[PDB]
Design a protein around this ligand. Structure first.
Ligand SMILES: NC(=O)c1ccc[n+]([C@@H]2O[C@H](COP(=O)([O-])OP(=O)(O)OC[C@H]3O[C@@H](n4cnc5c(N)ncnc54)[C@H](OP(=O)(O)O)[C@@H]3O)[C@@H](O)[C@H]2O)c1
Ligand SMILES: C=C(C)[C@H]1CCC(C)=CC1=O
Length: 310
């Protein structure tokens, strides 16, 4: 059999990744940080799939808790003896909303427009302030949770699961990242140079980038230290995740390890805005989880490029 573990799978894109992999006949370990939510998600998905009980298994996993990470590896080893697919899907935004929550989507739309302009050769991100009566608050505690969940989480879980993934004939890791991890949006020239210097990339260099960011937001130096004007922790964490994807792909050459953007999809993180359904979003990480042997590794794929790979 093939076995897949999906993090952050009690709702959103992660839940649909579990659906789509299970439909392909892969035995899915649906994981969640909250045990009650995860057990209820498993019950719902099993009902909707209408498949036998052994097709979908639950285990608790909080990607920010080292004991939880270690325990899931012990569980997989005892129950299955290998792992074929790891999908690092869990993530948080680092932002708290005050007032009209649709301001979150105004920033997303502005950032997509900015990225398109930058990719077309423009040299700076336009300033942006929202229309509606809300604001996105970005504080240290949320930024730390964002970095620890979105960057340290995939790194630590990847590292814990290497022995089991090495026992697969086609080991696959898919990191659910974002187009907003583009270095074009990162602002900080030092960090852009470090994360972009692929030949010198190491885990220690990426850790240093994220820790310098966290010290700056702790001290209120984000503008003076040239970090992004908004979605700072999200951008930093996803850029770091993309860099770690490259590091890990080089370190584990028999694996295929890739980062993706699912597209802008209706989930709790977006207040259920965005053009894509959750099922549409999940197609992207599923595509990379099922990548044939010999395919790309170490890369970041936006939605349309991912879906065109094969
Ligand atoms: N939706 C989009 O437009 C979009 C676009 C680009 C990238 N993404 C990425 O897609 C991924 C999935 O997010 P989503 O859109 O599906 O949002 P979501 O509905 O908010 O789901 C996030 C999931 O991550 C889980 N999670 C958060 N912190 C965790 C932790 N410490 N340990 C384990 N699980 C944790 C959440 O669990 P709880 O229920 O316990 O909170 C939930 O299951 C994220 O990495 C996000 O950055 C989304
Ligand atoms: C918090 C964010 C802005 C995430 C999730 C939503 C989208 C569209 C992209 C991201 O980077």
């Amino acid at each position: 059999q093939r076995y897949a573990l999906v993090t952050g799978a009690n709702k959103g894109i992660g839940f649909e990744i579990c659906r789509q992999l299970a439909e392909k006949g892969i035995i899915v370990i649906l994981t969640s940080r909250n045990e009650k939510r995860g057990l209820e998600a498993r019950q719902k998905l099993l009902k909707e799939l209408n498949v036998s009980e052994n097709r979908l298994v639950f285990h608790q996993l909080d990607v920010t808790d080292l004991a939880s990470v270690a325990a899931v590896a012990v569980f997989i080893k005892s129950k299955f003896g290998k792992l074929d697919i790891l999908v690092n899907n869990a993530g948080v935004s680092g932002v708290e909303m005050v007032g009209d929550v649709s301001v979150f989507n105004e920033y997303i739309e502005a950032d997509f427009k900015a990225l398109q302009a930058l990719e077309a050769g423009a040299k700076e991100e336009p300033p942006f302030k929202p229309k509606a009566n809300g604001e996105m608050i970005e504080k240290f505690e949320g930024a730390k949770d964002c970095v620890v969940t979105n960057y340290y989480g995939p790194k630590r879980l990847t590292q814990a699961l290497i022995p089991l993934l090495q026992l697969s004939p086609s080991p696959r890791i898919v990191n659910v990242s974002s187009s907003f991890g583009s270095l074009l949006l990162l602002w900080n020239e030092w960090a852009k140079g470090v994360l972009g210097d692929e030949d010198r990339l190491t885990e220690e260099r990426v850790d240093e980038v994220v820790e310098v960011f966290l010290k700056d937001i702790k001290e209120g130096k984000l503008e003076e230290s040239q970090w992004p004007p908004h979605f700072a922790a999200e951008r930093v964490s996803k850029a770091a995740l993309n860099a770690y994807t490259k590091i890990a792909a080089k370190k584990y050459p028999s694996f295929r390890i890739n980062a993706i953007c699912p597209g802008y999809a209706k989930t709790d993180i977006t207040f259920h805005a965005g053009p894509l359904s959750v099922a549409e979003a999940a197609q992207v990480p599923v595509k990379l989880a099922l990548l044939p042997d010999g395919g790309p590794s170490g890369c970041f794929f936006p939605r349309d490029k991912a879906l065109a790979l094969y």
